[PDB]
Amino acid sequence: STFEEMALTTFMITKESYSKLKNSVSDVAFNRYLSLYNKYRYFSGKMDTAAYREAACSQLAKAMETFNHNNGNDVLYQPPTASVTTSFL
Amino acid sequence: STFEEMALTTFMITKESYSKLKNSVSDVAFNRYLSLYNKYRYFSGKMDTAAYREAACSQLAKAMETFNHNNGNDVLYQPPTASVTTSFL
């Protein structure tokens, strides 16, 4: 989907950007994402690739409410840091 | 792009998914990947997100060649098992 897809890319949250994003997600999900963010906010270490994706959406949510209560500033959105460890594929 | 998007998912390679995938990628690209299989098959450790993506592609290119060379018997493609250590912003 566009939202989760976007939460996995670096970009600027702007007027256009944010508008695009509010309209690609349901507020029930958006507010759900905004809640979990607290779950991860201060967590560092390994997690399954599926948990990373859910986590990134959370950060996108937070990054969005920040821009919205900025008065249309512009905020940089970078996916949460990822050091992936694979072994001989 | 189709090739990479799928290198990120688990699916059964069939005559139909081989082909869709092959048509999408140039021989140069496919072979490069196939060739990078020889790098990642032995990689064991931390890599960033783009590297993991190229890693998953080399793994799919390889699975396709395994498909092609076993007379088209189904071969399950599966992205390289991974754990991402994270921190947010």
Side-chain angles (χ1 to χ4, degrees), chain A residues 5 8 37 40-41 43-49 52 55 59 76 78-89, chain B residues 5 37 40-49 52-53 55-56 58-59 80-89:
Chain A
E5 273 184 6
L8 293 173
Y37 179 49
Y40 306 101
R41 206 308 178 197
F43 180 85
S44 280
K46 324 167 303 187
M47 71 179 71
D48 52 309
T49 157
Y52 174 80
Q59 177 169 291
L76 175 57
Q78 292 184 275
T81 293
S83 203
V84 341
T85 208
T86 65
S87 269
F88 322 115
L89 290 182
Chain B
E5 259 197 332
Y37 177 68
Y40 296 107
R41 32 169 22 174
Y42 312 129
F43 203 110
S44 181
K46 320 188 141 178
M47 35 169 72
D48 65 308
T49 299
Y52 179 82
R53 285 168 179 245
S58 67
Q59 164 109 129
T81 267
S83 77
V84 32
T85 83
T86 329
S87 11
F88 321 84
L89 81 130

